[PDB]
Amino acid sequence: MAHFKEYQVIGRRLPTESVPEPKLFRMRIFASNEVIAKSRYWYFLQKLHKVKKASGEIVSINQINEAHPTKVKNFGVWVRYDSRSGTHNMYKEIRDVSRVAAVETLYQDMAARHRARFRSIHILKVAEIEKTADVKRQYVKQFLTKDLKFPLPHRVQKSTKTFSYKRPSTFY
Amino acid sequence: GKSHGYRSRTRYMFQRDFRKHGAVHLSTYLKVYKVGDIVDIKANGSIQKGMPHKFYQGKTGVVYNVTKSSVGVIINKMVGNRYLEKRLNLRVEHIKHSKCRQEFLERVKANAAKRAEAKAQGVAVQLKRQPAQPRESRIVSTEGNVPQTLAPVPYETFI
Amino acid sequence: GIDHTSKQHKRSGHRTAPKSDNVYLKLLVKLYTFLARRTDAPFNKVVLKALFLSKINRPPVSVSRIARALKQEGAANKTVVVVGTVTDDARIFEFPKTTVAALRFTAGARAKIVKAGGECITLDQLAVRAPKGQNTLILRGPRNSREAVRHFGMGPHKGKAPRILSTGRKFERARGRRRSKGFKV
Amino acid sequence: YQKEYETAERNIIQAKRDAKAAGSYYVEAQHKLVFVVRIKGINKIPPKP
Amino acid sequence: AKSKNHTAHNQTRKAHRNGIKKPKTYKYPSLKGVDPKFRRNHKHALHGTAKALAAAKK
Amino acid sequence: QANNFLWPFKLSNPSGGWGVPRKFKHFIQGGSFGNREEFINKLVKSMN
RNA sequence: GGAAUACUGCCAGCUGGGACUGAGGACUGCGACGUAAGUCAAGGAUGCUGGCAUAAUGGUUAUAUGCCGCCCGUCUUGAAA
RNA sequence: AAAUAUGUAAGAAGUCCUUGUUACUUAAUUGAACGUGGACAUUUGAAUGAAGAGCUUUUAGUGGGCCAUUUUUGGUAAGCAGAACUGGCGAUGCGGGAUGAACCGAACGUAGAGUUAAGGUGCCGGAAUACACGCUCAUCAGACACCACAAAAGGUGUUAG
RNA sequence: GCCCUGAAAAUGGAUGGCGCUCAAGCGUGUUACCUAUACUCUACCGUCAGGGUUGAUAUGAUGCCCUGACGAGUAGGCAGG
RNA sequence: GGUUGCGGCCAUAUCUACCAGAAAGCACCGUUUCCCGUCCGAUCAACUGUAGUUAAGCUGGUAAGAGCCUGACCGAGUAGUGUAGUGGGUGACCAUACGCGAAACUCAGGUGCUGCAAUCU
Structure with a gap:
């Protein structure tokens, strides 16, 4: 919840002798660090499949960078x-x-x-x-x-000092 | 005024199990009890004699006496800031060998044995239980299991 | 702060020195704390401590009691040590030889021991002979034999002695002491 | 120990690249060790914790 | 004036200052309440085994 | 036995701060408390 | 296709500025650098220079200034009341 | 039929082999108890911690309590009355909440340097009249937990859906 | 969503006050900064603990010395003064 | 494999309906002198194993059968719940973070297992 990165999270249910090789599921999650992203992975998975992270595992977590930034x-x-x-x-x-x-x-x-x-x-x-x-x-x-153009009327420059020896203008 | 009889508060506790009323099967009378056995107390309200008071329901103690029809049991009860030692005369209908003392004895044997084959090979043993450990690295493959990607789902009313 | 798990500034509950002001005792102490410190020898550590004990915890060791201990197998030639006083006892007749080191002998006890050809030693004298406690038999009086302790733990069904000042039927023998008078204990 | 370490770490790195290369995913061992720092002071704390 | 009637408040704090320890366990415990015949015979059993142990010392 | 021989480490407050407006929520929720995983190193380094 | 850079992390990589402290009081310890004799930043500061005498400085006291500071004793769950 | 709470166990006072005692017990040297003699000590039987463990005597004060989260009963309700577990106040200053017994932070020998907590940084006042995207114009705007209240219902105000 | 109506009480008055309107307001994000008797390092006082040491050798052996940890307090207990 | 006697667990074993059962067993079944019990030899007692029968009991089969049992990422990680915040909301209440986790539902499968002793084409 901040400056966002986007992650692939890939997880699965833990293997059983009955089902080794259980199906893999991926989500793209937007979060700020990877601890949040995996949290978020489980939050969604739990609302979509019977799994709590106590019965599952995260197989891969990878940041997905923008292709044409x-x-x-x-x-x-x-x-x-x-x-x-x-x-x-x-x-x-x-x-x-x-x-x-x-x-x-x-x-x-x-x-x-x-x-x-x-x-x-x-x-x-x-x-x-x-x-x-x-x-x-x-x-x-x-x-x-x-051919979109526009002005930016009424420009306010920030002043570095507290007093100024001229009345400012907004002219851009 | 208030009311605190002996079987006060016991309506669900001493009740019989659903569809399990009536005669008590003979297994109960065929168990043998020894001084030093560990029993769990649990009242059978169909047998009113030799009956544990309700504080002892669900509690486990040691046999200290054996009698025509009952065992005496030692329970340690907390009163104040200190356990007091209590002895109970329960009839056998209300008592049952503690199943965990059984796993335990089984393991003590298993342990003696593991020790034997180890010595008669002259090797290290390792006989005490470790707790569940973290989990070692794995390689999961993707052959037949290309990850299916999921997304959250829109709200909707079903009413 | 600190979540303390145990009382702070608690003092070990032990005497560190005798409460007495008897110069001589302090000297025996001064001797033994050298010995205790400078030798291994469990013995002096024990004798050191026993020097600090208050009177109730040095009950007297009697001369028949030494007679008996000397009958332990392989004990007859040990020198028996009493960090306290030894009292006479007209109850043994045959009393054996040995060497008793004690804080104090009553007159009869010295007599008894001596007459049988034995010897009375003080603790410093025992020190020189046995800097490491070699061949010693430490003995202790019966401490719970004291009158005070009859009344400890007094309560219903405890079997103890009331603190009564004056005794007979007519003193604390009726209601609560017999089934016929209220209850019993 | 410098070696031990240097090659365990390197090992893990190559493990991952190989899985990727095989179209698999290396999944790392779960951590055997943690550091814990208490960050609340000492008043008002429930008995069990 | 009415006043408060009951509470447990503070009582476990108090019991746990010095409190709880546990039972006071011994080998050779109180034979209190054990079958009288049985005990009476245990006596004789123990006497006898003592006897013999001493008999094996001549 | 090794770990027990080591006394509890006495850290300072973190130099540079906790980086969150409030410590007593979870790291997942905006910070301090709970398992922050690898990010413990950065925190401990500033406390050490 | 071959690079670069960002980001994150590691270095028993090299350096500048500022601040507080300097407990201890012969020698014993662990080391480091030296081919060596020796040296050292290695079980707590030294060295060089200067300043002060009806004074530098310190204690006290009065007053001003900044911030802060309700009346004690009592009984009470609760008193500046 | 949960969750939270709750009993017992995880061994030397143990295990195994041999065969002694009795008046109990058995059809029965058969059992039951208690033992002799013999064997097995590296992880001897999960974890974590232990600031030492165990024990005895004696005696002070107290025996009006109150508060908060959560569970909860009576009552329209109450800064009302009454219970449950824990943590507090009372017995306790300190930093924050302007103020304030009980909230937040944090508990206290005398000090120096550094760093923070909760809370703040226009000016009062130590600390950006900082950076960024929106939204809001009130002829009764709004402005920060506990907390110092506001509802049904309405708006062709403006925003996004 | 914000804003407006719904919205009536008594001395004059309170987002703490001033005052603030692309905020000094509301929602959200990112950095830096201020500051407790708390945390870190050091000196000193005391308390508790552990340890050394009159072996012949001036002046305290309930002493001297080394080391680690700890310090809130009513009613109340004990201690040293 | 059948069957009987004595059982263990106590419906996967009970319920309803319809079939089928060789051999031995079991049963129904014939009798009333005797011991014995009835208003009633029906039950209970005794007697024969002789006159008869698988009709019933009993055993097993059938059934989109009632019930019972079991499984399942069936519903549902839902309801509820331990812990966290100076989270949202006027409030009712709700969301998120670390955990635990049902019931009904649905669908699939199943309908006694077994110990001792005896006996049987």
Whole structure:
């Protein structure tokens, strides 16, 4: 829950003489360190298969780096979450350079707008959106128009000293 | 006012097991008891004589006496900040050899034996139990078991 | 802080020196703590400690009691050591030879021992002869034979002696002492 | 001991690369040892812990 | 005035200052409450085996 | 026997801090307490 | 295809600045560097220079300034009340 | 039919072989007890710790308690009355919660240097008017556990779904 | 979700106060920084423990010396003064 | 393998219905002088093993059979629960972290095992 890395977690049920070689399951988990990621792996597995980590084991844990960490992409994000009064699915879009960058703004946004802390959200799917205008959401489409430019009116420069011998301007 | 008779609070404790009321099978009368045996006490409420008071239900002690129809049992009971030694005269219907003293004796034999084959080979033994150990490295293969990847699931009502 | 598991600043519960101010005893002590320190020899360590004991814990050892110990197989020639006083006992007739080292002899005990051709030694004298306690027999009086201890642990069914000041039927023999008068003990 | 260590560690590293190479996963031995530091002070503690 | 009626509060703290130890175990324990005939015969058994042990010392 | 011969290590408070706003939650929950696995080295090094 | 860099970790790798301390009082110990005699940072500071005399400095005391500080004794679960 | 709690065991006072005693017991030298003599000590029978273990006498104060989390009974409720386990206050300062018996942190010889906890860092006041993405405009905004309250119900305010 | 209505009490007044509106507000993330009688290292006082030492050799053997650990306190117990 | 006597565990053994059973056994079955018991030789007692029969008992088979038993990543890692936070929420209550973990449900399989002694195509 912080500056996110994304991990492959791969686990399985412990072998039995009856079933050596039990099936392997993978999740992609966003977390900040690997102790959290494996926790998170088990949290989800327990809600999906009978297994507690006391009957299972983690076979591999590997960080998945962004393939094109400077191509700008538009991501579709699918999320399940709890409100003070129920639980909701929700599709949002995020424009960024990496999943890991996108996911982090997802979490800030769920916090800002819906007052959803991390314990309350599940990431359902995160996906680069291939064709522009499969993009559904205005506030990301806006950036997709041709020869896009804008000013940044009213610039405030931070001052290094407490007094200034001239009245400042906001001119950019 | 309040009420604290001898069998107070015992409605579920002295009750017979579901579909197990009635005559007590003869095995109970065929067990033999020796001074120094370890028995577990558990009341049979169908036999009202020779009956442990309810504090002793579920407790295990040592046989200190053997009689026509009962064994005497020594229980150590805590009263205050100190155990007091208590002796009970239970009829046999209410008593049962402690099964763990049996594993124990079995292991003592097993132990003597392991020691024997070890000496009559002149090798080291290692006779005491270790607890469950951490787990050694493995290589899991992927032949036929390419990992299936799962994701969390959307909320939904089933009502 | 510290989660203490045991009382802090607890003092060993043991005498470290005699409570007495008898110069001579201190000297026997001064002797034995040299001996105890400077030799191996369990004996002096024992004799050292026994010098610190209070009077109740040095009950007297009697001369018949020495007679008896001397009848142990292989004991007849040992020199018997009493870190305390030896008392006479008109009850043995034949008393044997030996050498008794003690803190004190009553007059009859010296007599008895001497008359039979034996010898009375003090502890420093025993030290020179036996710096390591060689061939000694340490003896101890019956400590629980004391009148005080009859009344310890007094209670219902304990079998003890009341602290009564005056005795007979008519003193603490009725209700609670016999089935016919209330209960019994 | 420098050697012991140096080659155990190296061993484990190569184990992993070989599994990967075989399309397998090396899974490391579970830890036999931990260091524990108490980080709560000493008041208000429940008897069992 | 009414006052408090009962509580165990503090009682285990108190029992555990000096407390609990355990039984006081001996080899050769109290023959208290053991079958009188049996004991009476055990006597004779023990006397006899003592006798013989001494008989094997001439 | 070896380990017991070693007295309990007396560490200082960590130099550089605990790195979390609150120690008494789990490491998984934002920090201090519980098994932080390999990350014990960094913590102990700053305490030692 | 061949690199680089980041990140994380290791070095019994080399170095700069600042701060507090300097207990002990012949010698005994473990070592290090030397071909060697010797040397040393190896079971707790030394060396060089300077400053002060109706003084440097220290104790006390009064007052100011910063922060802090409710009335004791009692009974009481609870008293500045 | 759980979870938490709960009894016993994990050996020298043990194991095995031989064969002694009795008035008990058996059809019966058969058992039952207790023994002689012989054999087996490296891990002798899981873990972790042990700041030493065991024991005796004697005597002070107390015998109004109260609080918090959790379980819980009476009551519309109560800063009400009454139980359960633990931890506290009482008997206790210190740092934080402005304040405050009981919360958080942490328990206390006299001091120096360093580091932190809980809590904070516009100014009062030691410490970024730090960095980052949003959201919010209240002719009654809001601002931090215990804690110093707010609900049903409504809004074509604005946000995201 | 935030915000607005629903939202009435008595001396004048309290997010602690000032005041704050792309906050000094609400949700979330990341660093740095401040600070307890706590933790780490060192000196000193005491308490407890373990150890050495009058072997002939000036002045304390209930002494001298070495070492480790520890220190809250009402009612109350003991000790040394 | 059958069957009988005495059993152990006490339905995988009980329940309902329909079949089938060689041999020996077991049974029903014939009798009323005797010992013995009845309102009643039905039961209980005795007598023959002689006159009869597998009808029943009894044993085994059948059954998308009632019950009982067992298994299962069937439901469900759900309900509940030990521990954690100056977590969310006006509250009711809820989420997360380290653990433990059901019942009903569903589906699959099963329907006595066995000790001693005797006897039998």
